[PDB]
Amino acid sequence: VHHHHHHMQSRNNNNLKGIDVSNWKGNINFESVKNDGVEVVYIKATEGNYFKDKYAKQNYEGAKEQGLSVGFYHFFRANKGAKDQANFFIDYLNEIGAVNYDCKLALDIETTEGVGVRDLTSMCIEFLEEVKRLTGKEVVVYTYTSFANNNLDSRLGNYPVWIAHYGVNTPGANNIWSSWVGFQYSENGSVAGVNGGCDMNEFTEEIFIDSSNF
Ligand SMILES: CC(=O)N[C@@H]1[C@@H](O)[C@H](O)[C@@H](CO)O[C@@H]1O
Numbered sequence: 001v002h003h004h005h006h007h008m009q010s011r012n013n014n015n016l017k018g019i020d021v022s023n024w025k026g027n028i029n030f031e032s033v034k035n036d037g038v039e040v041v042y043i044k045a046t047e048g049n050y051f052k053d054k055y056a057k058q059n060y061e062g063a064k065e066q067g068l069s070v071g072f073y074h075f076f077r078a079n080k081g082a083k084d085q086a087n088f089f090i091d092y093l094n095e096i097g098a099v100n101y102d103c104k105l106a107l108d109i110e111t112t113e114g115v116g117v118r119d120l121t122s123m124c125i126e127f128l129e130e131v132k133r134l135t136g137k138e139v140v141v142y143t144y145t146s147f148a149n150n151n152l153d154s155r156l157g158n159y160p161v162w163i164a165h166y167g168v169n170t171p172g173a174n175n176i177w178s179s180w181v182g183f184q185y186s187e188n189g190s191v192a193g194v195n196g197g198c199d200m201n202e203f204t205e206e207i208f209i210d211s212s213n214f
């Protein structure tokens, strides 16, 4: 409970250096990524209830063999069942044998698919809770400032956020969150081992999984 106005933290060199990738990046040299000082790598696993990212397994194994902390994210499509997507997401992680990820499972919500604020937010909650039920692990929500302020409601504030807001040292005013565990500050980074623009992030220690229901 707030007793005064809270605000998003600014970047800090002591936070975890991270990146996030998907099939869009193709083959990645994680030894190079590691040598660049990167500490965390989020990997796209699934999208909707039908798409599997072909590079999820090689990215997971490639990053882990270099000692990088890893997490997975799911690109949400609100026109598909929430629990259905949660199961599709986790089923794929098990299919590729990714059973030692270090970071919270991420819900990438950035499109409405025509769904209203209350309903879209409820779908997100159902997804998050189903993922928690299935894995016994914790979750995090990825979205961008304007989306949080106009397309979702405060109930999602009960979950930590990995917020996207490029070109700034501090994420903008947010009606749902006043603190972040993740901050995607650039989509054009030059990272060794990664071809083309790379998503750049800062993560706090709270991005790590540190509990289980089992
Ligand atoms: C967590 C993250 O940055 N996901 C991005 C998503 O925002 C973007 O829309 C998509 C297509 O460019 O690529 C990645 O999935």
Ligand SMILES: CC(=O)N[C@@H]1[C@@H](O)[C@H](O)[C@@H](CO)O[C@H]1O
Residues within 6 Å of the ligand: 067, 068, 069, 102, 205, 208, 209, 210
């Ligand atoms: C490199 C690695 O193995 N990842 C660990 C992660 O599992 C753990 O949750 C975190 C706690 O601070 O420390 C990281 O180094």
